[PDB]
Amino acid sequence: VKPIFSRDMNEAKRRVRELYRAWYREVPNTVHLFQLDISVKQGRDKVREMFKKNAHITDPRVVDLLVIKGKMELEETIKVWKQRTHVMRFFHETEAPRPKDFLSKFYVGHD
Amino acid sequence: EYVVAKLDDLINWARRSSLWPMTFGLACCAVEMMHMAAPRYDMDRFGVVFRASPRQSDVMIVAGTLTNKMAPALRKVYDQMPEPRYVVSMGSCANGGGYYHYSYSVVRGCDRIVPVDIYVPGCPPTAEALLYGILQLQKKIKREKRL
Amino acid sequence: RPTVRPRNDVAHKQLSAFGEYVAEILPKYVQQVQVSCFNELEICIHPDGVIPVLTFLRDHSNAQFKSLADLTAVDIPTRQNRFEIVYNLLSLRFNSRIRVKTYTDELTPIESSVPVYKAANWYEREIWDMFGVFFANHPDLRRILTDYGFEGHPFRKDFPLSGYVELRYDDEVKRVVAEPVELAQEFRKFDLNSPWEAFPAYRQPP
Amino acid sequence: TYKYVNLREPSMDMKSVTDRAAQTLLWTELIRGLGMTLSYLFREPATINYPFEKGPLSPRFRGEHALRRYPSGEERCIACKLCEAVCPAQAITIEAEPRADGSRRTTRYDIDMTKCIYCGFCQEACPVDAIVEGPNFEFSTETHEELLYNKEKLLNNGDKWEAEIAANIQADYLYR
Amino acid sequence: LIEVFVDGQSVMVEPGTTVLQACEKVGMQIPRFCYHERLSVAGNCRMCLVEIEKAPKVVAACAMPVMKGWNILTNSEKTKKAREGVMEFLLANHPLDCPICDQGGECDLQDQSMMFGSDRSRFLEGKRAVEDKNIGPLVKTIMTRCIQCTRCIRFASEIAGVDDLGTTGRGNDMQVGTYIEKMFMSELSGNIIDICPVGALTXXXXXXXXXXXXXXXXXXXXXXXXXXXXXXXXXXXXXXXXXXXXXXXXXXXXXXXXXXXX
Amino acid sequence: XXXXXXXXXXXXXXXXXXXXXXXXXXXXXXXXXXXXXXXXXXXXXXXXXXXXXXCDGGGGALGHPRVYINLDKETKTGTCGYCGLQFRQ
Amino acid sequence: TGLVGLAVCETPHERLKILYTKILDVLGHIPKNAAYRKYTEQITNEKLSMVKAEPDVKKLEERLQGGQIEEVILQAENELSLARKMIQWKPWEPLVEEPPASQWKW
Ligand SMILES: NC(=O)c1ccc[n+]([C@@H]2O[C@H](COP(=O)([O-])OP(=O)(O)OC[C@H]3O[C@@H](n4cnc5c(N)ncnc54)[C@H](OP(=O)(O)O)[C@@H]3O)[C@@H](O)[C@H]2O)c1
Ligand code: SF4
Ligand code: SF4
Ligand code: SF4
Ligand code: SF4
Ligand code: SF4
Ligand code: FES
Ligand SMILES: [Zn+2]
């Protein structure tokens, strides 16, 4: 069909599963080889919240592009690349962070 | 009382004599930084030595443009430097992004990564104007550790 | 005209022969649209087969190009199909410049030019970086000009010039260089666009 | 055009082989290379010490920005936003208000030195010739705040360089 | 309806349709100075001169209708020789205000010199200046910058109601002023500054505050005065200073309220 | 003229009960000399012979585009767009 | 004598004749109605006549090459690969692919 991408509907879901195992094994390895930073358990919780935002699945075309991107930004650790605890860090350290409420945001006055 | 005030100037004279800068080739500014070596305008062995080295050097010149890729890279160089360290932001890109600025990749100000003591405003920072940056650094060192 | 005209058309009819010669083969698979203006030739190619077009012009008895050197891509949101990957080709034996274009939206993968041209793989990484177009059967697709912790694709007209992650503080944390801060200085949006049409003949009827 | 870099066998037989072998057995050409720097040592060096001697320049040179004025008082800048739009760095900002009564010449006038890549474009785009680039080198600060130029003021303080600017512009009208 | 081809392409038009009105259907805008939207059709400039397929003299677009099936070219050889010439006549007696002038980019005459008129040179020596006309609150009027046309003259007579602007002389001395020293009435005459193509009549409240270059425009309906819709407001960093009338089909007849303009 | 401590130059306000201004405390703030445009009125008005006069700073050397100024009204003298120089008769 | 390129300048005649006769047969396997066979054949036959007439002359190498026989041999070496790829992937013989959307002007 058009266009190919990589997988058709059901096959695209199992490509995410293979991607999930490869990244789950690296988070204990990126403590001793990289840096302690936060925690091994807290690093694994960062994985689950990342896939929840990506969880929609309507077409295999969108899913396949996420796999290629998932084998790049999460690949920035496996083959040993320089980051120095600045790159590949997803969580905000200095975030305020803002909340969504008609009493909290309106008191600060924004938009 | 009199010996205390005069000995402090003698330690400050040691840095007034010689300053070893870092040779960062991260700019068009770096070619003008190579004009400091060019005989017509020289601080070479007047104070400047082009040996550089990441650890032995006292001064580091941030030459021009810095990207978000080089932002963690230049920071770890600053940590390797000894305690008497002076940072010169030679070039308009180093001062706050001469060009680009509003761009996605270029870091604005350099002070967001590494604190700056002496600012040089010039894009093609003329070697004549570059001579001020080292001479002002030598003049700025006045008094260190009273008590 | 003495200073007003750059060059008179003389090789324009000679270059128009190429506009017929490749079109004499007449594939719906390859040819489609042939445009020739200002001593230059432009061809756009159907997404299904890009590699067979690139194997052509390479070698060939009539015209020898070989060098498929420089590789660009166009971002335009006017059409239903978004991106336009543009190949700039040069001949050493023949001494001529021809253009190869793609018309597809290419959010869905497109065929790679790596088996035909060796230096094409480095340019293919840039298109995946800036525009976000994946190349099928590509060896080593790695980020070059983008940051290691960069989200999205930096060139697309859908998002601003400043971006989302751009400002990098140091402040409170001893070693970690900041990322989530988003604010930058105000880029003044110029609304300078001249009234009246600039040139005749370029005007299209609604 | 062809020039050829390859020598294509300099040695042939007996006489041509021995001298090509002599330079590799001992040195000769290294001693000949030693003589190049030897004569280079004796000839006088072209060196300029900055606090006393000064380097060569030109009648038209761009450095630190300074806005000029008319011989009989009056600020020469007319407020157009002309130089604002040409500026490729967008370093120059201008907001204009009427001056007391009648005259309409500026209020906000900031030129960033954190920006500005130095073109002379603002010098060229100006119809009244307000910003004229003077021969400037001396500028060194502790902060960005001290470096970026305020609402005219410090730009108007370029009177110390305006005497040179008036001399330099006399070599500028009907260009060179 | 009779059809007549303009620039080879055929376009259907009404029997009493103007030449410039017929040009709009073919998607081509002729160089204008005397309006076609709402102001009455009048000559008194001869800029919109177009050459027919078989005609010795060029006819004005504002006055002459198409009527019969005749071919008219917009990018003709005679038209380009005309357009470059008339621009030179307009600028032989023009005071040169462009950097100081309140308009700059918004000025219609400024664009037409760049688009149509002769660029390389303009033969001129000695330009006449007119004395400043009296004006009340809105629009700081300068008679020198005025090109002496018929746009604001008919605006006071037809659109505004109360007539004030007219003719004062004969040659290159005729002013567009009121002749007698009297301030202009309010009502709806505040929109007269937006009508004029040249930088002669421009709002005194927002004069020299911001140029046309570097100003972000946004369309919004006015709160003050009922039945007011579509009015462009220029941001130009932080606080909005200039508000101009935006084109509307039914809500407003391309004229802002005097209370809303200030 | 100066308000409290800081001197006003080319129409500028210092601070409302000292809140905004804090940086100019250790270092002295800049001030343009004679920025009140007193030198504009100090120059004497030149007499005109013709109905319209052309203005120039100092030929093509000094930056002044040529503007013609009309003299018709007896009250209030006419001045050019670039200069504060006034003309009568 | 040696060529400037990495390809070794070997004194070999009729080597060009074998490769140019081989490619003519490959073209007459699958495409027949296509213009690709009809146009490429008459250029190759024109070049083969120059080789038969001129015996090891530099003027024969100067015709449509002018970079010796080594550059002309490279043109024949990749010609067999180009003909086989054109025979495998149908494009010249068949035309049935969909047309693009109506937009071109910028
Ligand atoms: N972890 C703990 O130790 C701990 C536990 C409980 C509570 N705290 C509280 O947290 C605070 C920690 O601060 P710290 O000890 O980290 O500060 P610090 O390192 O002593 O730094 C204070 C600085 O202020 C200057 N300074 C202070 N008093 C001065 C004077 N009279 N004259 C001149 N210079 C003076 C000193 O400069 P010079 O050196 O040049 O004079 C010094 O560099 C304390 O105030 C304490 O109440 C700390
Ligand atoms: S300031 Fe100018 S010379 Fe220096 S790096 Fe930036 S663009 Fe290059
Ligand atoms: S510097 Fe010149 S161009 Fe810029 S606003 Fe002033 S007068 Fe106009
Ligand atoms: S020199 Fe260039 S960058 Fe600097 S203010 Fe002038 S136009 Fe802007
Ligand atoms: S009316 Fe238009 S062309 Fe004439 S000076 Fe004013 S802006 Fe320039
Ligand atoms: S003021 Fe404007 S609209 Fe009125 S006559 Fe003059 S140019 Fe025409
Ligand atoms: S624009 Fe038609 S007569 Fe003036
Ligand atoms: Zn003047």
mmCIF file of C-alpha atoms and ligand atoms in Angstrom, chain E residues 33 142-143 145-153 165-166 176 192 195-198 200-201, ligand 6:
data_model
loop_
_atom_site.group_PDB
_atom_site.id
_atom_site.type_symbol
_atom_site.label_atom_id
_atom_site.label_comp_id
_atom_site.label_asym_id
_atom_site.label_seq_id
_atom_site.Cartn_x
_atom_site.Cartn_y
_atom_site.Cartn_z
ATOM 1 C CA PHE E 33 -5.053 58.017 -7.329
ATOM 2 C CA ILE E 142 0.427 69.905 5.522
ATOM 3 C CA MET E 143 -0.429 71.451 2.136
ATOM 4 C CA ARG E 145 3.005 67.175 0.815
ATOM 5 C CA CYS E 146 -0.361 67.202 -1.024
ATOM 6 C CA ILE E 147 -0.301 66.295 -4.739
ATOM 7 C CA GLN E 148 -3.432 68.412 -5.460
ATOM 8 C CA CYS E 149 -6.013 65.802 -6.455
ATOM 9 C CA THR E 150 -9.826 65.436 -6.118
ATOM 10 C CA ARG E 151 -10.141 62.651 -3.494
ATOM 11 C CA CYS E 152 -10.682 64.644 -0.256
ATOM 12 C CA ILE E 153 -12.471 67.412 -2.221
ATOM 13 C CA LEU E 165 -11.947 71.418 0.740
ATOM 14 C CA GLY E 166 -11.723 72.730 -2.842
ATOM 15 C CA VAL E 176 -6.610 71.828 -1.162
ATOM 16 C CA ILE E 192 -10.360 61.900 5.914
ATOM 17 C CA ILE E 195 -8.480 58.406 2.622
ATOM 18 C CA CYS E 196 -5.586 60.546 1.282
ATOM 19 C CA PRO E 197 -2.799 58.604 -0.550
ATOM 20 C CA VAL E 198 0.007 61.105 0.201
ATOM 21 C CA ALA E 200 -0.466 65.316 3.734
ATOM 22 C CA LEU E 201 -3.441 64.531 5.987
HETATM 23 S S1 SF4 H 6 -4.884 66.309 0.611
HETATM 24 FE FE1 SF4 H 6 -4.649 64.219 -0.303
HETATM 25 S S2 SF4 H 6 -6.758 63.666 -1.012
HETATM 26 FE FE2 SF4 H 6 -6.756 65.929 -0.660
HETATM 27 S S3 SF4 H 6 -6.255 66.834 -2.708
HETATM 28 FE FE3 SF4 H 6 -4.267 66.611 -1.580
HETATM 29 S S4 SF4 H 6 -3.463 64.566 -2.241
HETATM 30 FE FE4 SF4 H 6 -5.688 64.614 -2.811
#
